[PDB]
Symmetry: C3
Subunit: 106 residues, 3 copies
């Protein structure tokens, strides 16, 4: 998928998580976020379209998604243990990383 589509997946599934009632819904939503974050790694944001895929900005962009993936991992395992409110809180701290990337590259 293209970058904007993966971002919609991330935004929609974060909201699913905030409204979720059980761990199965949280896990499903986090797994869709993980897929979207991985697919976004191959993308070039519009503000960097003319730069090298290996420029420091593009390597930083891709590390941003690795950071997000490890945060998704933490929430996924919290949900797996049945700690639904903890998984939802961990999902909320993802926004720190969403915003940090947006500030630089959106």
């Amino acid at each position: 998928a293209d970058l904007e589509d993966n971002m919609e997946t991330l935004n929609d599934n974060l909201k699913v998580i905030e409204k979720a009632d059980n761990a199965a819904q949280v896990k499903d939503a986090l797994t869709k976020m993980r897929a979207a974050a991985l697919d976004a790694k191959k993308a070039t944001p519009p503000k960097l379209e003319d730069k090298s895929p290996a420029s420091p900005e593009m390597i930083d962009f891709r590390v941003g998604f690795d950071i997000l993936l490890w945060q998704i991992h933490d929430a996924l395992h919290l949900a797996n243990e049945g700690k639904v409110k903890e998984a939802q809180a961990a999902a909320e701290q993802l926004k720190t990383t969403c915003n940090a990337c947006h500030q630089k590259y959106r």
Copy 2:
């Protein structure tokens, strides 16, 4: 190790997982696949040898192993929980990633 040898390791241990009887066997084979996928990620595939190392294709190639690694992660945790058939089903799901990369970069 070189890319062909790492792919040998991935294919051999996928077959071990398919025929395994117990969780320890599945977990051992998955651990070897994780190691091979990481070692493979540093390679330049022959199809991309004559392209720029800074090409989008090289970045995409490496994201494919990141997808594979997160799928291996799921199967590893299922095997760690002792869920042999669920871990085998998660390992079966790797094949779509294997073939999708091959279609582009073998």
Copy 3:
């Protein structure tokens, strides 16, 4: 942070894990190591400043942190299961990755 600061974080927190009494201490040190490894991924080591950012050497460098991150993952889950001594053993194993990178790129 720069590479040297991230290396300090990794080394200091490994020392904490080596002297830890309980899983909470180990998990806290391992999460700080995970953050430093992700941050180090954006660095260029002095020895590779004369290489392309997409050169095989720089890919090897960045993938070395992926290897470390999955080893940090193993120790984190072992600590989460209450296997403190097994987590410490896994952190000891991590050191082979640190030294192998230093041998190549320091």
